[PDB]
């Protein structure tokens, strides 16, 4: 009855997709403490909510920047989708609002930091440790794809570790609701599926490619296609030859061969049995898919926490003022936000 659960999940999503929440807070309800990470657009700050005393992660987007990088539709997508979804490994959007200059998305603060820093620091993850996270993405993409959502920015930088050691997916800036095919060249070069790179028109299968990249990077400690410049990377991806570390298990290599499959007719996640080809692969034979959904599996790694507003699992960033003009910018563009 995954079928049953997904059906009612869809009902719930559609209600919110159709009547999105709006304007549920304002900037002066929060004290801005420290930047937690920057993206390509705007920054995420640790903040304290005055009346509750709760900490959150406030994503701040400058409207004029959003316009300048042609991200208007993407940003409306981002917020419209994030406020409507509900899943154990998706970060929670707690508030949203806008002012003359900026767009604000307030999420639950996930204090364990990025998978990225942990991965670079440790070097690589054991196969059981990688499998534990991968399982969570598999379930998440099952959910998202069932709602006709493509995610399109899977990477360690956008996966957060929580206080239980489970994953929280963040950054829906490239997420999109679509049946069938879309064409936007967007994502992160190391993670692009070859059909994106080749301007084909692509679908939801690009997320299963990216999962392959993720599992490889997690277990190898470096990505399957790397180079000094994006062009060089896309070359490698299109050529499609992949080499594996000597320590990769046979099971892992076979799975990765079915995910990093240039042939859409052959890529796992995509076919007849759908996700089942992935859930039933030998590499996941020891995965208890229900227990994972239920968060009953003991995490292989639990970050150190030093209370409420500890940001020690995050790098430091140079701080900048957050200006709010006395004139409203891009009012029409962002009306539904």
């Amino acid at each position: 009855s995954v079928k049953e659960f997904l059906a009612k999940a869809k009902e719930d999503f559609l209600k919110k997709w159709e009547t999105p929440s709006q304007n549920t807070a304002q900037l002066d309800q929060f004290d801005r403490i420290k930047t937690l990470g920057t993206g390509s657009f705007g920054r995420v700050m640790l903040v304290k909510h005055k009346e509750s005393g709760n900490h959150y992660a406030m994503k701040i987007l400058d409207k004029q920047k959003v316009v300048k990088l042609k991200q208007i539709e993407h940003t409306l997508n981002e917020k419209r989708i994030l406020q409507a979804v509900n899943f154990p490994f998706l970060v929670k959007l707690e508030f949203s609002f806008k002012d003359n200059s900026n767009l604000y998305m307030v999420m639950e603060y996930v204090a364990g930091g990025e998978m990225f820093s942990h991965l670079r620091r440790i070097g690589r993850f054991s196969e059981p440790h990688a499998r534990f996270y991968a399982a969570q993405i598999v379930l998440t993409f099952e959910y998202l794809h069932s709602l006709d959502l493509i995610y399109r920015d899977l990477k360690p930088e956008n996966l957060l570790i929580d206080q239980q050691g489970y994953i929280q997916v963040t950054d829906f800036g490239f997420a999109k609701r679509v049946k069938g095919r879309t064409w936007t060249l967007c994502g992160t070069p190391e993670y692009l599926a070859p059909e994106i790179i080749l301007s084909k028109g692509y679908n939801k299968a690009v997320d299963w490619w990216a999962l392959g990249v993720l599992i490889y990077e997690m277990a190898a400690g470096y990505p399957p296609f790397f180079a000094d410049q994006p062009i060089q990377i896309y070359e490698k991806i299109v050529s499609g030859k992949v080499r594996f570390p000597s320590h990769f298990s046979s099971d892992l290599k076979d799975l990765l061969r079915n995910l990093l499959q240039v042939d859409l007719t052959k890529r796992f996640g995509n076919l007849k049995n759908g996700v089942n080809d992935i859930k039933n692969h030998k590499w996941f034979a020891t995965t208890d898919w229900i227990a994972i959904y239920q968060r009953k599996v003991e995490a292989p790694f639990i970050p150190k926490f030093k209370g409420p507003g500890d940001t020690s699992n995050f790098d430091d960033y140079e701080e900048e003022e957050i200006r709010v003009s006395i004139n409203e910018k891009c009012g029409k563009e962002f009306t539904e936000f």
């Binding site: 390509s40 990088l69 991200q71 994502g187 992160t188 070069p189 470096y222 990505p223 790397f226 000094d228």
Partner: peptide, 20 residues
């Protein structure tokens, strides 16, 4: 080694997106 070549490369930090 592959690792050595990655580590010496310019893409070992947080990666930017494209939309390009």
């Amino acid at each position: 080694t592959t690792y050595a070549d990655f580590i010496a490369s310019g893409r070992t930090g947080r990666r930017a997106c494209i939309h390009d």
